[PDB]
């Protein structure tokens, strides 16, 4: 069933509910929610690159009866918050992790791995 | 050094099926992505299908969605393909390829292939 | 949807430029490996992740992306370069491979 976010940073986002584990292989919110503070400073600090959505969409994904599996932000997504937020991650010495590597999501228009674009 | 080596090659009908399987040694299987790729007589490589670590994420290419399905067993780091409705254009031969990386949540991309192995001839003939 | 020119001549010593084009309209990012293939043999991985050679591959092969083209570029080309030429990427449809160069050592 699903479960009320706890995660801080993805509270308030548009979707209320999420389920464990994430797609980051979390067993818990608590969990999640501690891999993810790394990410605290780039998200308050605005690279205008969507990447609380992004996180959130990987982190704490959205659950609805609706769909069975998580929907995750699609590969595009991944790649312009990378990129977005690539410079204020040289100032503060923050290499993009590998469990974030984007060539592992799907892009739009794949009719088996759904993908979500940003509000 | 990696070695795959693939089997179940052979002679199917139009409309038979086919089941290939790929023994993996040399690295730890079960971090990496791993790949079927084939090649008609005379023609280039054509993705066929990927799958993931765990084995979560199976993805096809066009010529074979909902006819195909991949899959592993990772406690004998074997990979297999299983093919049905065959056509004539699916002779090929059939590489097992291993990937650079692991990990998938559906998406898959050929950038990284880092092992082939010598591949299994599938004939689709009357 | 991935573009490489389907043949290439260069003589011995001179440079062969590869290229693998795709979807330029692409707001993201690309990767590209490219994989050589002799007739009779399995393929043969000389770059990957755009511009990663493998340990046993000559230093002669290079890759480089350019906006949405990747371009092998073989530097000092020997008659054992002469071989199938075909970049590894993503469609919009998936994983994919290039058409293919075949590339022809003169001389």
């Known amino acids: 069933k699903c479960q009320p976010i706890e995660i801080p940073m993805c509270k308030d986002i548009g979707y209320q509910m999420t389920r464990m584990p994430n797609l980051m292989g979390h067993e818990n919110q608590r969990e999640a929610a501690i891999q993810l503070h790394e990410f605290a400073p780039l998200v308050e600090y605005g690279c205008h690159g969507h990447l609380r959505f992004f996180l959130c969409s990987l982190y704490a994904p959205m659950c609805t009866e609706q769909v069975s599996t998580p929907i995750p932000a699609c590969r595009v997504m991944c790649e312009q918050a990378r990129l977005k937020c690539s410079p204020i991650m040289e100032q503060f010495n923050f290499k993009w992790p590998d469990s974030l590597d984007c060539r592992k999501l799907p892009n739009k228009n794949d009719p088996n791995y759904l993908c979500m674009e940003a509000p | 050094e990696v070695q795959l080596v693939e089997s179940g090659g052979g002679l199917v009908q139009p409309g038979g099926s086919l089941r290939l399987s790929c023994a993996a040694s040399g690295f730890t299987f079960s971090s990496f992505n791993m790949f079927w790729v084939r090649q008609a007589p005379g023609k280039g490589l054509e993705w066929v299908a990927g799958?993931?670590?765990?084995?979560?994420?199976?993805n096809y290419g066009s010529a074979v969605k909902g006819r195909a399905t991949i899959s592993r067993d990772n406690s004998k780091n074997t990979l297999y393909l299983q093919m049905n409705s065959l056509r004539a254009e699916d002779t090929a031969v059939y590489y097992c390829?291993?990937?650079?990386?692991?990990?998938?949540?559906?998406?898959?991309?050929?950038?990284?292939?880092?092992?082939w192995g010598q591949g299994t001839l599938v004939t689709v003939s009357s | 949807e991935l573009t490489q020119p389907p043949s290439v001549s260069v003589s011995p010593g001179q440079t062969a430029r590869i290229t693998c084009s795709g979807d330029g309209s692409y707001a993201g990012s690309y990767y590209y490996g490219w994989y050589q293939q002799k007739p009779g043999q399995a393929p043969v991985t000389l770059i990957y992740?755009?511009?990663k050679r493998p340990s046993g591959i000559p230093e002669r092969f290079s890759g480089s992306l350019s906006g949405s083209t990747n371009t092998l570029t073989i530097s000092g080309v020997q008659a054992e370069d002469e071989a199938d030429y075909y970049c590894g990427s993503a469609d919009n449809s998936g994983a994919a491979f290039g058409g293919g160069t075949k590339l022809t050592v003169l001389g």
């Open positions: 992740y755009n511009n």
């Open positions: 799958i993931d670590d765990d084995g979560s994420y199976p």
């Open positions: 390829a291993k990937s650079g990386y692991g990990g998938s949540w559906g998406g898959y991309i050929a950038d990284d292939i880092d092992a």
